[PDB]
Design a protein that fits this description.
Blueprint lengths: L22 H9 L10
Bound molecules: zinc ion (ZN).
PDB class: metal binding protein
Keywords: Zinc-finger domain, C2H2, Structural Genomics, nppsfa, National Project on Protein Structural and Functional Analyses, RIKEN Structural Genomics/Proteomics Initiative, rsgi, metal binding protein
Assembly: monomeric
Length: 41
């Protein structure tokens, strides 16, 4: 039995659907998207 709701974040990736709580954190995930790491690689 679960007892906890899920909240939204101020940031959200528009490439996969991720979400971060830091403008800088998101960027790091929006830049690494290119190359050999589209998500999990
Ligand atoms: Zn992403």
């Amino acid at each position: 039995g679960s007892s906890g709701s899920s909240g939204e974040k101020p940031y959200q990736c528009k490439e996969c659907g991720k979400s971060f709580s830091q403008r800088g954190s998101l960027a790091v995930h929006e830049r690494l998207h290119t190359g050999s790491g589209p998500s999990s690689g």
